[PDB]
């Protein structure tokens, strides 16, 4: 799809930087039991997208 490694990785990094679970502006009200949960959840969700997209954008899965 007229993509390359640079454009691909940059889109992944950008896509992850804008969906990172925003931490609360303050630290006293924020407790980890939920913050770290989003981190582990996001990190696990990010790895899934990278594994899926790499296969979709693979040029070996294209046509003539």
């Amino acid at each position: 799809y007229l993509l390359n490694k640079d454009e691909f990785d940059s889109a992944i990094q950008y896509a992850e930087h804008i969906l990172k679970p925003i931490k609360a502006e303050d630290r006293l009200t924020a407790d980890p039991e939920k913050e770290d949960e989003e981190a582990r959840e996001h990190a696990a969700r990010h790895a899934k997208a990278v594994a899926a997209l790499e296969r979709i954008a693979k040029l070996e899965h294209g046509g003539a």
């Binding site: 889109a11 899934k48 899926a52």
Partner: protein, 96 residues
Amino acid sequence: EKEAMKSEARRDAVVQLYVASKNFIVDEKELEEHVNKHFTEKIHNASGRSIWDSQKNPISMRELRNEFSGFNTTSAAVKTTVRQKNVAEELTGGKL
């Protein structure tokens, strides 16, 4: 700058394909977990044996045209949020 614009458009698609990768199936674990959850005999309101019983009919033209002429009726608030979100995602590009 013209080639950059095309790259940005090429990026938004990858960003949209990134958000929609939550429901994909990349490993056999997710596949088996998905099949065993959905391919159950007593799934279609069971009683019904088909999607038709659970969800009467697939959307038709009569139902599509009635969504903009017959009603205009409170789903406007249910839809506008679907469009306001889309507008914000386009301008900001942050996938709200």
